[PDB]
Write a protein that binds this ligand. Structure first.
Ligand SMILES: *[C@@H]1O[C@H](CO)[C@@H](O)[C@H](O)[C@H]1NC(C)=O
Ligand SMILES: *[C@@H]1O[C@H](CO)[C@@H](O)[C@H](O)[C@H]1NC(C)=O
Lengths: 349, 49, 387
């Protein structure tokens, strides 16, 4: 099998060759041979992206491509999804810029994502909320690009239990004075859903309002990866920074390798129709890999990707923020329990 | 049922009765789906069709 | 000083009128700084350069905006997709021409988009007034299960909840229709006599033939039909009393070309601001930057009138809503299609010549039937209902 590994950014030039032999040594399964090819992308320009990928897809006839990065550029993810539509070659991302949440899945595409759905992250929050017993709270969201409150209505469905929860909805904030509307807040527990790029002016408007100290906590949960901000911040990571991102290259190539290994043992064939970009000017032929990933077991954990193509039960991580501009991780999260550090004038006993 | 005959004669509508699939009057229940739009019992069949 | 624009189309004759129009629309602006150039390019059906020619030439020319039109090729949501990703990559506004697809209606995938022609999704409102003005009620709809199908329902119920006039049944079928007769059987005993079909053109032929031997296209059967399911093979094998919509500005863009050039010419007057007027990035060779004055002038783009051109009702709304458009309701008589009237924000029914219905009855077939047969449920409760 001619598996391909690619990177974006000159920082991966040295490690492109280093991870080569590691992939061959780390991945060892019967009936499968690994042939990685080390590549480095020239920045993130559009026309090279199609040129470099397709020419390698034609000149070298790559069989599956896995891309990873550490930047904050999610722009090229749909384009990578876009070209893969006409070749039927599955593409899996790991983390970084072009690995954030994407929806929906384009027709005739198999762009698997190693990300965490927004609803799944929100569900984890309420498990944290009951542990600390913060019943009264309000979430805040703004009018931001690529945002829809529909994914945030899972809270309305939930909260029906014997403990009861309180809400006040949310108030939208325009990009462009903000102190005249944000005053409608009653609880310190606030949840944020907005663009990270425009969050900095939003933070400044809230910081000048006195909503910075430990009296008022802030939540930063969503596709707003960051690894002037207030104290007491929490975020979801899904092991994006930890879990040996230098080793995940062997992990990502492994799962796709099991896909062809299982397909061959289930249907012995070599369907390399996507050998060339322009082999046939049609989009009616498909090798049908979407019917896979029902049962993916590795690392004593399940990696069964759904129709949406995200990890159903990933290792979500809760992190904190020291007041002295210091990033830190507090507690831990696992399958269905919340073993966490720190479990336990008007404040009197 | 003795009331039902009186109505049918007065207005000309015919009928055929049939009891409830499961013997519950009807409420709203949801554990793994939408909280509303889940009517069981008599409240279910009347709404369903 | 000089501002470049994107003018990709599918006809070499159309690009000629651009040069004279820009050499005419310059005098409309007064030519304070108007030295604009056409800078048009021709696309190719092959899928190799469609990911290349987007920035091979257009972005190298330091364009401010691009105009894309649907080619006469028999395709949908295919040609305006490459420009959607490329323009959004640089956060460049992109506007479509004759872009009549419903998937170009979410901002999540296409951050910036516009079109001067309404898509098939919004005609659902036109159905409501027609059944409202004809005093129709107890209606059912047959919709496929796809992107249009989901977009087909969702608009429809929002306009019915104020009066709570819920449709009797919303049964739907899969797009891969193949000898469907059981589904049509269910929609027979419900006493509707009015049906709204909004599938694609190919799907109409199957259901039309499937309903042919079911004898359910006789009298007491009023049908509401959308634009996409009139032409093509849907023209054949159709019932007589088919009522179908249209759009007068459709299948032409010469008048749209004048409007498209003029509206972007109005942008220059409000480009004179103390805020930064930084030009878009130049060259596709490599860039990590975007030009931030895009959304700054976006808000004024929908805040314009631009009288005349096309009926003089050019307003624009989010994601190329194209608020105002004439539809010109038409009808089938025998075999030769006819016209019954036109439509705007509120319907007009001139009744040009006449209207016909299946079976040739010269009277509106009231779609309803009293159900003189109905079931009763009961539970076993001792003093009231023994068993
Ligand atoms: C019911 O029907 C019968 C015969 O069909 C008719 O004689 C009778 O008048 C009807 N009921 C009423 C209230 O008119
Ligand atoms: C066409 O527009 C006019 C003007 O707004 C309005 O009365 C209605 O929407 C249409 N005309 C008629 C007679 O319905």
């Amino acid at each position: 099998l001619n598996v391909a590994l690619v990177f974006s950014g000159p920082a991966y030039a040295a490690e492109a060759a280093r991870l080569g032999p590691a992939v061959a040594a780390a991945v060892r399964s019967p009936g499968l041979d690994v042939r990685p090819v080390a590549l480095v992308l020239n920045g993130s320009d559009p026309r090279s992206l199609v040129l470099q990928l397709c020419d390698l897809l034609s000149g070298l006839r790559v069989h599956g491509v896995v891309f990873e990065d550490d930047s904050r550029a999610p722009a090229v993810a749909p384009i990578l999804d876009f070209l893969s539509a006409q070749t039927s070659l599955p593409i899996v991302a790991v983390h970084g810029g072009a690995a954030l949440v994407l929806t929906p899945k384009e027709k005739g595409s198999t762009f698997l994502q190693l990300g965490s759905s927004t609803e799944q992250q929100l569900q984890v929050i309420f498990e944290v909320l009951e542990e600390y017993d913060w019943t009264s709270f309000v979430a805040v969201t703004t009018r931001a690009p690529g945002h829809r409150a529909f994914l945030s209505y899972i809270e309305v469905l939930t909260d029906g239990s014997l403990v009861g929860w309180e809400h006040r909805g949310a108030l939208t904030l325009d990009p462009g004075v903000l102190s005249a509307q944000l005053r409608s807040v009653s609880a310190q527990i606030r949840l944020l859903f907005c663009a990270r790029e425009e969050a900095e002016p939003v933070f400044r408007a809230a910081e000048e309002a006195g909503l910075t100290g430990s009296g008022y906590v802030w939540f930063m949960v969503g596709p707003q990866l960051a690894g002037p901000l207030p104290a007491g911040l929490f975020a979801v990571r899904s092991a994006g920074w930890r879990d040996d991102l230098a080793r995940r290259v062997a992990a990502g190539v492994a799962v796709v390798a099991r896909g062809a290994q299982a397909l061959l043992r289930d249907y012995g064939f070599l369907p390399e129709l996507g050998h060339d970009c322009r082999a046939q000017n049609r989009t009616h032929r498909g090798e049908s890999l979407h019917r896979y990933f029902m049962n993916i077991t590795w690392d004593n954990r399940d990696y069964s990707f759904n129709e949406d193509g995200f990890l159903v039960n990933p290792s979500l991580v809760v992190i904190s923020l020291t007041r002295d501009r210091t990033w830190e991780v507090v507690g831990s999260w696992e399958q269905q329990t919340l073993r966490l550090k720190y479990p336990l004038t008007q404040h009197l006993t | 049922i003795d009331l039902l005959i009186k109505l049918a004669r007065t207005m000309n509508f015919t009928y055929e009765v049939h009891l409830v699939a499961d013997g519950k009057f009807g409420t709203q229940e949801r554990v793994n789906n939408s909280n509303k739009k889940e009517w069981n019992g008599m409240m279910g069949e009347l709404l369903s069709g | 000083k000089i501002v470049n624009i994107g003018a990709v189309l599918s006809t070499r004759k159309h690009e000629q009128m651009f040069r004279e129009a820009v050499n005419q629309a310059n005098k409309r602006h007064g030519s304070w700084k108007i030295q604009l150039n056409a800078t048009s390019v021709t696309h190719k059906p092959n899928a190799i350069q469609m990911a290349l020619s987007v920035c091979e030439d257009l972005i190298s020319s330091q364009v401010y905006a691009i105009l894309v039109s649907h080619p006469p090729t028999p395709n949908d949501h295919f040609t305006p997709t490459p420009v959607s990703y490329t323009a959004g990559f640089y956060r460049i506004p992109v506007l479509g021409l004759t872009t009549r697809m419903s998937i170009y209606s979410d901002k999540s995938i296409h951050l910036s988009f516009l079109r001067t022609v309404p898509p098939y999704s919004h005609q659902s409102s036109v159905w409501f007034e027609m059944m409202r003005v004809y005093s129709w009620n107890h209606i059912i709809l047959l919709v496929s299960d796809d992107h249009e199908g989901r977009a087909a329902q969702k608009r429809l119920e929002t306009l019915l909840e104020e009066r709570e006039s819920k449709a009797e049944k919303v049964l739907q079928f899969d797009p891969g229709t193949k000898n469907v007769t059981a589904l049509l059987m269910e929609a027979k005993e419900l006493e509707a006599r009015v049906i709204i079909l909004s599938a694609s053109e190919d799907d109409a032929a199957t259901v039309y033939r499937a309903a042919a031997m079911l004898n359910m296209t006789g009298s007491g059967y009023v049908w509401l039909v959308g634009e996409r399911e009139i032409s093509g093979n849907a023209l054949r094998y159709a019932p007589d009393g088919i009522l179908g919509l249209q759009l007068i500005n459709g299948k032409n863009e010469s008048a749209h070309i004048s409007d498209a050039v003029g509206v972007v010419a109005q942008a220059v007057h409000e480009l004179l601001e103390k805020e930064n007027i930084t030009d878009p990035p130049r060259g596709c060779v490599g860039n990590t930057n975007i030009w931030k004055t895009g959304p700054l002038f976006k808000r004024v783009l929908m805040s314009s009138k631009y009288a005349d051109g096309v009926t003089g009702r050019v307003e624009f709304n989010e994601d190329g809503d194209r608020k105002f458009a004439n539809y010109s309701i038409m009808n089938l008589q025998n075999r030769k299609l006819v016209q019954v009237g036109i439509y705007n924000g509120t319907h007009v029914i001139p009744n040009d010549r006449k209207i016909i219905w299946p079976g040739g009855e010269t009277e509106k077939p009231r779609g309803y039937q009293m159900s003189t047969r109905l079931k009763i449920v009961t539970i076993h409760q001792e003093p009231f209902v023994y068993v």
